[PDB]
């Protein structure tokens with residue numbers, strides 16, 4: 430039966446709850462305790478579910494192709510609630526107004542020049558320049574052997590205008606990252622693979638030429654959190670119990686909390702990475718000290734069903750140069766059939782790296798900024814019936830070239846200074862829900878080798 434040894438999982442978001450699920454199965458004889466600092470499980474995942482609404486406060490969905498989360502959802506009995514996103518028309522907002530996303534393009538890279546050059550997003554001259562670059566690529570281009578930033582890869586092939594006006598805001602989406610720092614190999618390795626096969630970027634994207642790509646749940650993403658807790662059979666969940674310190678107990682660890690210590694043999698930290706650095710002072714973790722973040726607010730406005738749709742499609746992304754506080758907005762009721770059946774619901778995002786001060790301001794200042802933006806964008810006065818504001822402090826890390834190797838080195842240092850302490854979550858192996866689930870599964874698995 431039960432071993433003397435104990436696993437403590439720290440953080441009750443998706444990474445920590447997934448970790449407990451997988452730990453229950455991998456180690457029938459190991460004791461499992463989960464410490465969550467706040468009043469609830471779920472971390473960033475939270476769903477507003479009153480008055481027949483199902484409106485996401487944090488992540489709204491996940492990439493279906495990352496099927497580990499689909500598999501978890503099925504295994505725990507939630508498969509029947511899976512819904513896909515509707516596709517219709519999306520837009521880029523810049524200083525020149527609301528432009529439809531150009532047709533004839535894969536990830537903003539033109540594959541049909543005639544259709545693409547109908548766009549108003551670039552000037553005629555910029556369009557001619559994109560065409561000349563695509564059809565007549567320089568012999569001086571070289572396929573990158575080592576990883577380089579996306580912007581360094583893309584700018585010489587496509588020019589600055591297309592990268593700035595279309596690709597960056599398209600590919601960054603609600604996350605708002607900087608195209609010029611993100612890794613090429615870790616984000617879009619198929620660009621390079623296809624270029625190498627087709628001999629040019631334009632013909633590489635043409636190999637890739639063609640119900641949306643995303644999954645959520647009818648009962649809301651928070652129902653996933655709730656079901657995970659429910660299917661745990663022996664893990665002890667302690668809410669309102671932040672981990673405050675880690676000390677050595679002759680090979681084991683003493684974990685300090687407000688209500689007395691927990692003793693552990695294995696510790697999985699799934700909490701924000703700057704708390705990792707502070708909790709593990711004998712570990713030299715500059716990689717984690719230099720991993721930056723920004724904060725995001727979501728501001729959701731519920732309107733009585735509208736005769737003139739405020740946005741004529743699923744939503745828009747905003748060019749960072751334009752005079753707006755919002756970085757993106759979604760017509761939730763257009764994108765998700767289940768969320769708000771008899772209403773018009775808009776969800777705006779606010780916050781970029783190096784520019785997120787609005788997120789720390791009051792609800793009235795945040796709301797007013799979002800309202801002004803939309804009233805200008807939509808042409809008219811808008812009178813929301815209800816507003817739901819959520820704030821995801823330090824929520825998005827900026828992964829740059831060499832991240833994955835830096836995280837390997839962080840993990841080796843932690844294992845060498847604190848044997849039995851493992852890390853998982855959004856700082857490490859990908860920001861998205863499925864990446865975090867995988868992060869949890871792989872770290873649980875690797876404890877399995879070490880017993």
Ligand SMILES: Cc1cc2nc3c(=O)[nH]c(=O)nc-3n(C[C@H](O)[C@H](O)[C@H](O)COP(=O)(O)OP(=O)(O)OC[C@H]3O[C@@H](n4cnc5c(N)ncnc54)[C@H](O)[C@@H]3O)c2cc1C
Nearest residue numbers: 440442443444466472473488489672824854855860861862
């Ligand atoms: C604005 C925004 C939008 C996003 N949209 C998407 C999306 O559409 N699709 C997608 O796939 N991903 C999205 N993500 C990424 C997604 O949120 C992450 O994949 C996921 O929530 C990370 O979960 P986690 O458990 O690692 O961290 P968190 O959700 O941050 O959970 C950390 C937990 O640890 C707890 N904690 C903190 N300190 C302590 C302590 N000292 N002791 C104990 N517990 C502590 C916290 O209270 C929390 O419960 C989005 C992220 C943001 C910021």
